[PDB]
Structure formats: C-alpha cells, structure tokens
Design a protein around this ligand. Structure first.
Ligand SMILES: C[C@]12CC[C@H](O)C[C@@H]1CC[C@@H]1[C@@H]2CC[C@]2(C)[C@@H](O)CC[C@@H]12
Ligand SMILES: C[C@]12CC[C@H](O)C[C@@H]1CC[C@@H]1[C@@H]2CC[C@]2(C)[C@@H](O)CC[C@@H]12
Ligand SMILES: [Ca+2]
Ligand SMILES: [Ca+2]
Lengths: 176, 176
C-alpha cells in the first residue's frame, strides 16, 4: 500500500489541500493509517473558515490532540494512547449527530459532544482539508505546537470523494 | 477494603457531599476504584458555584464522560474504555497546570487543556464535591443523563483532606 511523508521540506505548510462541496456530502468520516516516532505535530486540519470555523487533529506528547473552534465550541483536548511508537495505527474521525468521534486502532477513544450541527446544513458550503499542516499560522492555534509531523500516511479516505472539488499540493508528494 | 454503594434509594441525590477550603489545598488529585454494570450515571460532581463553576464525571454508554462549565470552558466530552464490565477500575482525576487529566487503570485517557487557573487562586474559596449525584437538577446539565449510578466505590481520596471543611450524607452510606 502506497504511503506518503506527512512533512515536506521544513514542514511549514501542508503537503496537500483538498476542497469539498458540503452540499454533496453523504459521508463525513475520514480514515487513514499513520506511522511515526514524532511526538508533536499536525496530522490534518479542516475548516470552512480559518478564523472561526476550524479543526485540527495532531499529536502532542505522542498522543492525539484535537483543537476545534466554531460557533458552538472552542476546545483543546488530548486523548488516546501514544502513537509515536513507530507502528502503523488506524485512525478514524467522524460525525455522529452533533458529536465528533475519534477512533484509534478500532477503539473509540474520544467523543466531543455538542460541537456541531449537520455539515451539509452549514453556512459556507465549502470545506478545506489540509494534511500535515494548518491553513493559518501555528501561533494562532488555541494552543500552539510545532506543526511539522515527521511520519507516514497511507490508506487515507477523506470525507466524501464525490463531494471533492479539488486537490492541490505546494510541492510534489514524497513516498515513504 | 470497605466499599460503598454510589446510589441511595431512588438515586435522585448524592450519597455524600464534602466541602473544602481552596486556600488550604496543596493537592488537587482525587482517586478511587469503582465497580458497576450500570452504563449511565454520575460518579462525582464538583463546584464552587452550581450555576457557572461546576464539573461532573460520570458514565454514558459505559464510558467516562466529563461535563464542565466555568469562565474558561464549557464542554461535554466522552473518553476511555467502558467501565461497566463489573470489574474494579482505578480512576484518577487531577489538575496539571491549566488542564484536567483523567486516568483509568493507570493510563491517561483524557486531558482537557486550557480549562482552569490555579484552584487556590480562585474567586470563591469553597469547593463542594458530591458523590453519586449532582448539586443541581440533571436537566440543567449541558447534556442531561439520569444520575443514578448503580455501582460501588472504594479506596477513595478527595482533593486535600487537610482542606476538607465538612462532610454530609442525606442518608447513611450503605456497604457493598
Ligand atoms: C471533524 C470534521 C468532520 C469529520 C471529518 O472526517 C473531518 C472534518 C474536519 C473539519 C471539521 C469537521 C467537523 C465540523 C467542523 C469542526 C467545523 O465546525 C469546522 C471544521 C470542521
Ligand atoms: C476537576 C477538579 C480538580 C481535580 C479534583 O480531583 C476534582 C475537582 C472537581 C471540581 C473541578 C476541579 C477543576 C476546576 C473546576 C472545573 C472549576 O472550574 C469548577 C469545578 C472544578
Ligand atoms: Ca514534530
Ligand atoms: Ca444508571
């Protein structure tokens, strides 16, 4: 299975950005496998607005961390086991009603409840997903961390491929 | 080791309430072991103000759930494995800087960051801890649940015993 490096060069920007049309979404889940020895960094970021409607899944002290900022909630939460042990880990993020669920290696490790309304029914119908980086300065995070994540990603599926509008990459993706 | 039932009668109120003087606190951690087959309910509640400075640790769908409401954050978060398997489980809740940490059976399963300033340096210097129930109607929770927790508690330590002002129990505690 083809795998890509989650950091390019200095690791100051995402390795890829995908844009989706929220009105065409019929699937909200995203899943992938990640391998790394890096204890801190951004796995993926998402927003419909970089100022007040954004989300970030990363690692801090080797463990998953989600920072989220929208009309309903603003939080910085760590959960789950360390993933920086150099082993492949299955990760899944999805919506379940008004909640965001995080599953690691088959187990639910975190459920952020009351954080969102239906996606398709959101104001701005365009969602951006960035891999290995944010779409705003790391210093503007609720809790800053250094975004560079020295790791590999494979078997990824992002939201609903049928709603994907476009995909870009500042620089060509590197294979692991 | 002596153990007590976490629910008395209809399970509409806590089995015990302890009050502490925050200025005398030198230890914030609380720990105990719990056993139960009940998937939903309140393990313990805490506040300095039932309207806008409160906290609740309970179970929903068998898993830990924390609801917290204060000047800095307002959240409803689920995390960790199910604990309603009828086996004894070690649980520890403590402050680590501005974060609230939750450990289950020796493992950190949840860290709510940026949710609080130093306790000793809080406005109202009195904190109440209630076991097996809340100090306000369940309907006023951020996300209501039925508080009755049919389970047993033992080996409990609450905050700093040297700062404990008093302890009450609506009805006499029952042994498991
Ligand atoms: C977590 C989700 C959904 C599951 C999907 O698998 C990944 C995306 C990333 C973007 C999140 C969105 C949930 C809703 C958010 C928090 C909006 O309020 C602002 C950014 C959005
Ligand atoms: C979680 C803590 C601390 C660890 C201790 O072991 C238990 C108590 C319960 C009460 C919490 C407090 C943390 C600060 C809170 C959220 C205040 O803002 C309002 C209620 C307080
Ligand atoms: Ca890193
Ligand atoms: Ca119950």
């Amino acid at each position: 299975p083809p795998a890509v490096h989650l950091s390019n060069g200095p690791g100051q920007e995402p390795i890829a950005v995908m844009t989706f049309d929220l009105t065409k979404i019929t699937k909200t889940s995203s899943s992938f496998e990640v391998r790394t020895w890096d204890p801190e960094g951004v796995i993926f970021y998402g927003d419909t607005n970089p100022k007040d409607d954004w989300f970030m899944l990363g690692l801090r002290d080797g463990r998953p961390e989600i920072q989220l900022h929208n009309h309903w909630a603003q939080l910085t939460v760590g959960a789950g086991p360390r993933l920086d042990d150099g082993r492949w880990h299955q990760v899944e993020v999805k919506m379940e009603g008004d909640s965001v669920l995080l599953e690691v290696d088959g187990e639910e490790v975190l459920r952020l409840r009351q954080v969102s309304g239906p996606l398709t029914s959101k104001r701005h119908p365009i969602m951006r997903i960035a891999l290995g980086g944010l779409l705003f300065p790391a210093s503007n995070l609720r809790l800053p961390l250094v975004p560079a994540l020295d790791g590999c990603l494979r078997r990824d599926s992002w939201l609903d491929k049928q709603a994907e509008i476009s995909a870009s990459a500042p620089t060509s993706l590197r294979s692991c």
